[PDB]
């Protein structure tokens, strides 16, 4: 089924022509638009008082990256390199070796924040949930160099945001 948007024919009787002439001469629709704007002024604005108020978010929100660890305190990452393989932008660089106790751990875990597209494929490819994309988004920088993260920066981010990250994962892990 289809509709016509502009298939009306104006009436040509004297009253209709006089109405259209009154519209032309007295600017009635212009006054209607003015009235719409005037009414729209007297309503409450939609502005929030940033940074004292914040926009709504979701537990699924993808922000700054972080490396998590187990409750015992050992890092969850096992250097499987699945996040590196899935990364659509090749933003992850990983190097690994056996630890002094024989554990399978990374020696290098770099993510380029300036090549990252913040898609979240890395955190969903991770088997042990080692890497997550946390809720932080206010991490703007004055130089390009500080946006090149190494393993220490990501581990520090994890230790910094672990409470909120764990709460969000608890809220959302039944959808994954």
């Amino acid at each position: 089924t289809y509709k016509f948007v502009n298939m009306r024919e104006p009436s040509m009787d004297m009253k209709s022509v006089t109405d259209r002439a009154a519209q032309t001469l007295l600017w009635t629709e212009l006054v209607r638009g003015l009235g719409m704007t005037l009414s729209y002024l007297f309503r409450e604005p939609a502005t929030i008082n940033y940074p004292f108020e914040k926009g709504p978010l979701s537990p699924r929100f993808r922000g700054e990256h972080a490396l998590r660890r187990y409750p015992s305190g050992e890092e969850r990452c096992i250097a499987c390199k699945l996040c590196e393989a899935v990364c659509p932008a090749q933003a992850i660089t990983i190097e690994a070796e056996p630890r002094a106790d024989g554990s399978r751990r990374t020696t290098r875990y770099d993510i380029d924040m300036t090549k990252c597209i913040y898609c979240g494929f890395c955190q969903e490819a991770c088997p042990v949930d080692a890497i997550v994309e946390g809720p932080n988004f206010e991490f703007s920088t004055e130089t390009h160099e500080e946006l090149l993260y190494n393993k220490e920066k990501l581990l520090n981010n994890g230790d910094k945001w672990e409470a909120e990250i764990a709460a969000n994962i608890q809220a959302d892990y039944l959808y994954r």
Binding site: Y50, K54, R108, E162
Partner: protein, 144 residues
């Protein structure tokens, strides 16, 4: 009517601790609303809510004037909010960390840090791997 809006304005003036506190909040947050105190932060931030406001303005934070090492009477920023109050303030949950606190871990930071860009505490990238190729060291004793 008009008398009632003036009464609510006077109530807002009286609810901020007088005229001094009213001017303080007006010049620090550009707002004079009063709401129920939801919680107090270990760094000095105060958290208020008012469910009669529309979504987005129903929760707000009054920042502390002195965080880790700087004077924050004027230079406030959104990175000063700790992660638990960050989750509450961004409406990621309906539960403040006061009613139900987050899980405690030994590795979690006990002192939240703000954004340290443009500061001697800023992050500087570096390679974390060891040298790959080791060079030969010539002997120190003469051969002849």
């Amino acid at each position: 009517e008009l008398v009632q809006v003036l009464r609510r304005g006077l109530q807002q003036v009286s609810g901020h601790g007088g005229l001094r506190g009213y001017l303080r909040v007006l010049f620090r947050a550009n707002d004079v609303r009063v709401g129920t105190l939801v919680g107090e932060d270990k760094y000095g931030n105060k958290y208020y809510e008012d469910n009669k406001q529309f979504f987005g303005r129903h929760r707000w934070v009054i920042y502390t004037t002195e965080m880790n090492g700087r004077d924050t009477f004027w230079d406030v920023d959104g990175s000063m909010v700790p992660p638990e109050w960050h989750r509450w303030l961004h409406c990621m949950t309906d539960d403040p960390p006061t009613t139900k606190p987050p899980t405690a871990r030994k590795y979690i930071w006990t002192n939240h840090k703000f954004n340290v860009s443009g500061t001697p505490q800023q992050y500087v990238p570096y390679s974390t791997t060891r040298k790959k190729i080791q060079e030969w060291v010539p002997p120190s004793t003469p051969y002849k």
